[PDB]
Design a protein around this ligand. Structure first.
Ligand SMILES: O=C(O)[C@@H]1CS[C@H]2CS[C@H](CS)N21
Ligand SMILES: [K+]
Ligand SMILES: [Zn+2]
Ligand SMILES: [Zn+2]
Length: 215
């Protein structure tokens, strides 16, 4: 189930053979780790370089292969904070153009801007779809879908059950957010699990929960 770095800093818990969640801390942030035959792939980095370096260290050691790619889901620090570490180790950082621009705007190094509204990738082995459903928690927020496992990384668009309000809405679009959630509920009709950007893993109800927090 759950391995852990020396300090409290970091944890990784399994969902299936090839798919784990990574969580880092005062506030917990989540992403995914995908074990493929061609390398490790992360959905999202972490808060800052130190922690992203530690996360990369822990998964390379444990799975005995390299992190080759990361998918960045939006341009806030918890997503993009370890971008310097990625870029300089030759780790590919995929994102939409929008997310790339917003990163350069907030003074981060740029990810690739290679992702479109729908983009289907494959690593091995592992199939990944990225979907941009519209504006919500940020302007640029995308979700990630694993069709082989019907698994959705909702990111910071999607709130956990324990979450009782919308968090920081300074960069949010609270009218479009409901529509973009629906756009996800429409696109992906059978969901086995949903990973929120912050908090505990759940299912389709996290999305209805978020819908409810927007009323
Ligand atoms: O607005 C939120 O819910 C989250 C968690 S706490 C707050 C500040 S950091 C992170 C950027 S996604 N954000
Ligand atoms: K398949
Ligand atoms: Zn955010
Ligand atoms: Zn976040």
């Amino acid at each position: 189930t759950v391995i852990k770095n020396e300090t409290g800093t970091i944890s990784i818990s399994q969902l299936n053979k090839n798919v784990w969640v990574h969580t880092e801390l005062a506030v917990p942030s989540n992403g995914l780790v995908l074990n493929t035959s061609k390398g490790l792939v992360l959905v999202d980095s972490s808060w800052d370089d130190k922690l992203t370096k530690e996360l990369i260290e822990m998964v390379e050691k444990k799975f005995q292969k390299r992190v080759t790619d990361v998918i960045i889901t939006h341009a806030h620090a918890d997503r993009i904070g370890g971008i310097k570490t990625l870029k300089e180790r030759g780790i590919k950082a995929h994102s939409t153009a929008l997310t790339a621009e917003l990163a350069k705007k907030n003074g981060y190094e740029e990810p690739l801007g290679d992702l479109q509204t729908v983009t289907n990738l494959k690593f091995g082995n592992m199939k990944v779809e990225t979907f941009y459903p519209g504006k919500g928690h940020t302007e640029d927020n995308i979700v990630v879908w694993l069709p082989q496992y019907n698994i959705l990384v909702g990111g910071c668009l999607v709130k956990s059950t324990s979450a009782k309000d919308l968090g920081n809405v300074a960069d949010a679009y609270v009218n479009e957010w409901s529509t973009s959630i629906e756009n996800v509920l429409k696109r992906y009709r059978n969901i086995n699990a949903v990973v929120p950007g912050h908090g505990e893993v759940g299912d389709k109800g996290l999305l209805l929960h978020t819908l409810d927090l927007l009323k």
